[PDB]
Structure of Peptide deformylase:
Amino acid sequence: HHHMIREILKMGDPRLLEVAKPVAQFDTPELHEIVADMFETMHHANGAGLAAPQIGIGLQIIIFGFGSNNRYPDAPPVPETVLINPKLEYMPPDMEEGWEGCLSVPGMRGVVSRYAKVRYSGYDQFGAKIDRVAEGFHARVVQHEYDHLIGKLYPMRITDFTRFGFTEVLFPGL
Amino acid sequence: HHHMIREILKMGDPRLLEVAKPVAQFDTPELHEIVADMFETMHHANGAGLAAPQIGIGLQIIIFGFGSNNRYPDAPPVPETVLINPKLEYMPPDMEEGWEGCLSVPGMRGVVSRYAKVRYSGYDQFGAKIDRVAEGFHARVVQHEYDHLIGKLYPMRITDFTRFGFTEVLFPGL
Ligand SMILES: [Fe+3]
Ligand SMILES: [Fe+3]
């Protein structure tokens, strides 16, 4: 055996449009391996977050968080988190527009409106409960990764396609 | 003073969102050079068509046509055409969906609804009048290149973002 980093599926793959299945058991060796592979893939690609369907695993698992990120240099530190079987609550009415990218949409960015604040709950990989209120970029990452679990990619959320394009044109300094 | 092929602007460049100005004088040395550069750029990139704003020239000039095209291998021959100051007439109600790409959106395809038939008129680079009715892929490429003159790129026309993604995933053989 030689370890191979897991590849990220690109938009157009029908697996990214499926609705992920819940994780039935926590703290299994296999789940610890999945989480390790997700962090390895996310870190190698300078991701802000990653959802398991993006590496072909149809499960409700998301990871996110960094101290600094050079694909999103304006983003503040976000707590490193493993969030399994998430439940989100959106807090209307305050929305914020922001530029988003996605490792499954390589080379692009677009403006997406997100809730300024969300509640999220779920479980870590050991089965411990998580229950938080998030705002700003933290809230944006959680919404973006949650969307992957319900088959949504951020171009589906864009309303203004004059603000969608290639990162090297939109953000040359990056 | 070596000739440099003109580069194709990528989506995100604000020049692609502008509304192109009409050509005021036909049959000038400058116009013949623009047309030559457009064909050079289009052919090198296997384009089905090209609009002057895509090479940074804010003028109402489109070119299109080929015997065969390897980015759209199912497309039939389309008459090679230079169309300046185009006037299009859309013919409702018959619409057709088809997979479109764009040299300004490298690496992607998406399903776009177009009129099955259009009328188009305008002038060639010598100032002679052109007036045709086009159907199918011929009508599709004329609509696609005309859109470039009014600041529209095909993701602005997509309504089903489950059918938008990377060419290498959607069409592996290409
Ligand atoms: Fe994503
Ligand atoms: Fe185009």
